[PDB]
Structure 1
Amino acid sequence: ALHVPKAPGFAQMLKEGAKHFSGLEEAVYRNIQACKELAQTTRTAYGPNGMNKMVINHLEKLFVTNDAATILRELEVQHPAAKMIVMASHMQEQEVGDGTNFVLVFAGALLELAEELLRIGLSVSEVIEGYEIACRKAHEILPNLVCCSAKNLRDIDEVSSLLRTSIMSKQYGNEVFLAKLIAQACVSIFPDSGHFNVDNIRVCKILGSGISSSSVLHGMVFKKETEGDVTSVKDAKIAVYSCPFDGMITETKGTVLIKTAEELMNFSKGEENLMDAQVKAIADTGANVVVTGGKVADMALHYANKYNIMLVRLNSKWDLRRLCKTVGATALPRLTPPVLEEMGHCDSVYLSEVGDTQVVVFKHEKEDGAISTIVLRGSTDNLMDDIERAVDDGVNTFKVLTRDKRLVPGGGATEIELAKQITSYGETCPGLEQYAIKKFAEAFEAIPRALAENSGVKANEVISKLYAVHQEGNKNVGLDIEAEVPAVKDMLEAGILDTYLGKYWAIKLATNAAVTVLRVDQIIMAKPA
């Protein structure tokens, strides 16, 4: 009697390296513990006082950021329930662009409180019922917590004040500069129609100087050089070709069949005369700049130099398309001269040297266009990548405001008001659902708690102050990070605001992820290949 044998049935028929977990203890509680560990890995990065993390992935690439979704992507999350919470966070990133850390924090809190409720004696079904009804109540409530609205997205000061909050959590020290830049870019590329595309905001990261030397450019920048002798143009007449800058050849095998010394003597002269004719037709359309998506031939380059045309070679097709959008041109698959409509224009096209890097700039002078570039300067590539992520946050906030212009107070004010109202709803709801409603409410407290802990103050006093002020009636009051002691202030009057849609989607996705993790009861992992 010195060995316990596998029980007859599934335990014996299970494969060698496979695992099977069943029940509250082996499955539910272990999943909740994993999600809790995940939320703890990302909690200290939440908010303006949130700290950065230095993640090294399996490829030894370095990420310095406090962006939750980025940290999650670069982590090797291997527990399946944590993977599910990460999927929720990435869905938040896809739908909204900001709020991934809210999703993580809130999901982890819901799951911890769900474990506590299961221990006190509620069933996963009742917990899920209460969580769903409380998410519905939160969605019913949030529209009433909306405090302000944008009222204009063509301005540059209002848009900066609106994007500052989203670009403050990331890059707290320097946020007025970044909000100015991102507002300039967003309103440059904002068309008279209410549709806004975030891919039309381009970001060029050039080593050298620092974040205060960054700038916006109404146009495009390419870390390229020019193929020919011309480097500058002041009234660009750009002609864009998706084809190479070479003589067209057959898609079927072509052979030069010579049968006479005369044909042999004349073939190459005829080729160059053909090239000269092609490029001269292009130059005579007025084009002073040619942009080819393919290669350039030496003879064609020769004749472009002869006829004073700036030649640019863009390897990428997305780059070619975006340049076409920028200049108002059409990519021609043939080397035929462009018509007056197929041509593009720029107030200037020139080659410059930003730092060590050489760049070709298609710059409009007008304060508008279809594409704008943000040239990010910085002393480190990692710093510039973090600032690009902050730019992405600001741009996605602008898009969220184009979709829905409503705003809720930040710094935990909406979360505290939600917690209060949902607690008041659970106190009226009889039956075992009230426990889960009240825990769903208490989960919101995790947001101001995380903000306070990262601010460097006592979260319990901060939360007590917030509850007291929201009981006295102020729904726009949240915590003040610019205070060494626990403090609170009017989030609206301070200008710290979140997006109604951001909160909506974050709450929905966090609740759905928690509820799925709870709905799991048995786990049958396979042998890790």
Structure 2
Amino acid sequence: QIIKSIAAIRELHQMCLTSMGPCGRNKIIVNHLGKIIITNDAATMLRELDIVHPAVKVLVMATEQQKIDMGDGTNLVMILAGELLNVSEKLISMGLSAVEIIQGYNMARKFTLKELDEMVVGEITDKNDKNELLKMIKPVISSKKYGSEDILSELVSEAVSHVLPVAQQAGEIPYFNVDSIRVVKIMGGSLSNSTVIKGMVFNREPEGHVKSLSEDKKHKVAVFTCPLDIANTETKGTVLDFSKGEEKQIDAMMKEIADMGVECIVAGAGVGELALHYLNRYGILVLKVPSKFELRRLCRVCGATPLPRLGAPTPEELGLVETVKTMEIGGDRVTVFKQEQGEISRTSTIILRGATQNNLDDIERAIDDGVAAVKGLMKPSGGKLLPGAGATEIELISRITKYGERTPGLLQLAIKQFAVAFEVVPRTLAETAGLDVNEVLPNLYAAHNVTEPGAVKTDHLYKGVDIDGESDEGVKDIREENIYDMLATKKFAINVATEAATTVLSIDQIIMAKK
């Protein structure tokens, strides 16, 4: 029965093997609403797929740990946890109980986590410079839409630097926020036409004769939750003089707002027809926000506060914005909301353009996974790094096999198989790149295993898995392209991968029903 539980995961295992890596491939999954959705991230695909096997749901819940608490490793956790079950079949055939198999991984996990502190050579100074952020952000944006990582690097690094406030010698208070960056997409244009703007861009029409305000700083903006209508009574006031009453009352309510200097009225609900006529003569910009989730993030930008009532423009609830204009994004006229210097805001927006609608979905989701790695830049090992692209996975094998003969007892069988399970990462990178399996594997071993007349290690331990398709032959230093795996992502992925395979190996029996 333990073999059948692995075969059920093996059906979805090969799908994730072709995901991770810059040469990875994407799978089409039709949503239940009749819309084709395709993406690289496995955490999104596993939610849309129907999985009736409870053993597979263990890796699904373990994948959410990579998506929520971290910004990378969703494709890595499925490959590592899937291989631990394949290498465990050799111990099951020999008659070894699942206890020593799980106990062997726990002893090997502490040996691996201890060596990860020595795998860090360089450390990020957390300067938050535009050129310095390109080192951490580039590998996270990579492995999706290969070839666009150079242009998208400048768009993400500029938006993150705007969210981070200016401070020094304080690590207690958090700064970056994930929801503070909202990405917009409009069909048309190209990738080189994208830019970075500070604010929240609105794609809705101005709805009125006023397209944009002036260039004067500190525009008064009022956010009204109640829809625009004739003034009613809080107590009862049921309507069962109606047409002429709405003309005089609404004109009187809009007059008191314009007298205080408010040039913009934000109505989260629907706007009446008679309200648009009076706002055109007073020179007040019409803005509607049907999404209530954006109103919470808007209060931190301009400073306005939502009012459940109507007709009471309290000056304490009024915000200030320097610049409100209307620009053409993707071929359509849209009102942009931004600022320049004063009233520092933590909300930024990355504008994207392109002809293909499906390609804009992955780039938008790549930014969300890209900015999520900024959260991992904090005190808990945010500056430490390790070489990726198959460089670390091969080097750790030599250290694990060294501890196999060092630790006596039955654990020698589990430690040796623990290092072999890491050979799947370089193998998938060679298969998804079109390279032969018999080529990349022996070249990586000879590069990381040499005879050096000395105690200090020399030459290069940074040799990774090259994409090839260019240059001449062999691999090259991954440091040339400034691509690496963050220690917070790699170290946390090992603990999730071991606990994911532990649950499957610990279950020797299941009871289901017809569904």
TM-score by length of 1: 0.87
Cα RMSD for the two superposed structures: 2.3
Counterpart mapping for 1:254-265 below 5 A: 254-255=237-238
Counterpart mapping for 1:290-329 below 5 A: 290-329=265-304
Counterpart position of 2:357: 381
Counterpart position of 1:151: 125
Counterpart position of 1:24: none
Residue 251 of structure 1 and its aligned partner are, at CA, apart by 5.2
* Alpha-carbon spacing, 1:281–1:153, altered in 2? closer, same or farther (3 Å): farther
Q: Flag structure 2 segments of 5+ consecutive residues without an equivalent.
A: 167-172, 451-456
Residue 159 of structure 1 and its aligned partner are, at CA, apart by 0.7
Counterpart position of 1:7: none
Counterpart position of 2:146: 172
Query: Greater CA radius of gyration, 1 or 2?
Result: 1
Secondary structure, aligned partner of 2:511: strand
Alpha-carbon contact 2:144-2:366 (below 8 Å) kept:
yes
Matched, 1:419 2:397: yes
Match of 2:408 among 408, 427, 430: 430
Matched, 1:475 2:461: yes
* Alpha-carbon spacing, 1:38–1:119, altered in 2? closer, same or farther (3 Å): same
* Alpha-carbon spacing, 1:482–1:327, altered in 2? closer, same or farther (3 Å): farther
Counterpart position of 2:369: 393
Counterpart mapping for 1:52-67 below 5 A: 52-67=26-41
Matched, 1:28 2:2: yes
Distance 1:137 1:269 in 2: 82
Residue 356 of structure 1 and its aligned partner are, at CA, apart by 4.8
Counterpart mapping for 1:227-246 below 5 A: 227-234=207-214, 235=216, 236-246=219-229
Alpha-carbon contact 2:330-2:353 (below 8 Å) kept:
no
List per-residue Cα deviations over 1:440-495 (Å, max 9, x = no partner). 22111211111122222234442333333333444332122235676333333431
Counterpart position of 2:488: 501
Residue 74 of structure 1 and its aligned partner are, at CA, apart by 2.9
Counterpart position of 1:21: none
Counterpart position of 2:513: 526
List per-residue Cα deviations over 1:309-340 (Å, max 9, x = no partner). 00111111112222222222222223345455
Secondary structure, aligned partner of 1:203: strand
Residue 193 of structure 2 aligns with an amino acid whose one-letter code is S
Counterpart mapping for 1:190-339 below 5 A: 190-192=164-166, 194-234=174-214, 235=216, 236-250=219-233, 252-255=235-238, 272-339=247-314
Alpha-carbon contact 1:36-1:111 (below 8 Å) kept:
no
Residue 62 of structure 1 aligns with an amino acid whose one-letter code is I
Distance 1:285 1:497 in 2: 55
Alpha-carbon contact 1:205-1:377 (below 8 Å) kept:
yes
Secondary structure, aligned partner of 1:445: helix
Between 1:42-51 and 1:491-500, the stretch displaced more is 491-500
Between 1:404-413 and 1:351-360, the stretch displaced more is 351-360
* Alpha-carbon spacing, 1:147–1:247, altered in 2? closer, same or farther (3 Å): farther
Residue 211 of structure 1 aligns with an amino acid whose one-letter code is L
* Alpha-carbon spacing, 1:94–1:325, altered in 2? closer, same or farther (3 Å): same
Matched, 1:133 2:119: no
* Alpha-carbon spacing, 1:504–1:298, altered in 2? closer, same or farther (3 Å): same
The size of the alignment, in residue pairs, is 494
Residue 217 of structure 1 aligns with an amino acid whose one-letter code is I
TM-score by length of 2: 0.89
Between 1:47-56 and 1:208-217, the stretch displaced more is 208-217
Matched, 1:189 2:190: no
Distance 1:278 1:145 in 2: 67
Alpha-carbon contact 2:212-2:335 (below 8 Å) kept:
no
Between 1:372-381 and 1:351-360, the stretch displaced more is 351-360
Counterpart position of 1:6: none
Distance 2:468 2:293 in 1: 44
Counterpart position of 1:43: 17
Between 1:336-345 and 1:277-286, the stretch displaced more is 336-345
Counterpart position of 2:498: 511
List per-residue Cα deviations over 1:372-415 (Å, max 9, x = no partner). 11121111221100111211221112222235222211111121
Residue 184 of structure 2 aligns with an amino acid whose one-letter code is C
Residue 191 of structure 1 and its aligned partner are, at CA, apart by 2.3
Alpha-carbon contact 1:36-1:109 (below 8 Å) kept:
no
Match of 1:402 among 358, 361, 378: 378
Counterpart position of 2:453: none
Between 1:154-163 and 1:360-369, the stretch displaced more is 360-369
Alpha-carbon contact 1:171-1:390 (below 8 Å) kept:
no
Identity of aligned residues (%): 49
Between 1:350-359 and 1:170-179, the stretch displaced more is 350-359
Distance 1:179 1:55 in 2: 28
Secondary structure, aligned partner of 1:478: coil
List per-residue Cα deviations over 1:198-230 (Å, max 9, x = no partner). 111111110112333222221111221123221
Alpha-carbon contact 2:404-2:412 (below 8 Å) kept:
yes
Counterpart position of 2:454: none
List per-residue Cα deviations over 1:272-307 (Å, max 9, x = no partner). 444333222221222111111122233433322221
Counterpart position of 1:448: 426
Between 1:487-496 and 1:335-344, the stretch displaced more is 335-344
List per-residue Cα deviations over 1:41-90 (Å, max 9, x = no partner). 12112200112222223443212332222332333233222222122112
Alpha-carbon contact 1:43-1:105 (below 8 Å) kept:
yes
Residue 440 of structure 2 aligns with an amino acid whose one-letter code is V
Residue 341 of structure 1 and its aligned partner are, at CA, apart by 4.4
List per-residue Cα deviations over 1:506-527 (Å, max 9, x = no partner). 1111111101000001111112
Counterpart position of 1:371: 347
Counterpart mapping for 1:449-468 below 5 A: 449-468=427-446
Residue 96 of structure 1 and its aligned partner are, at CA, apart by 0.7
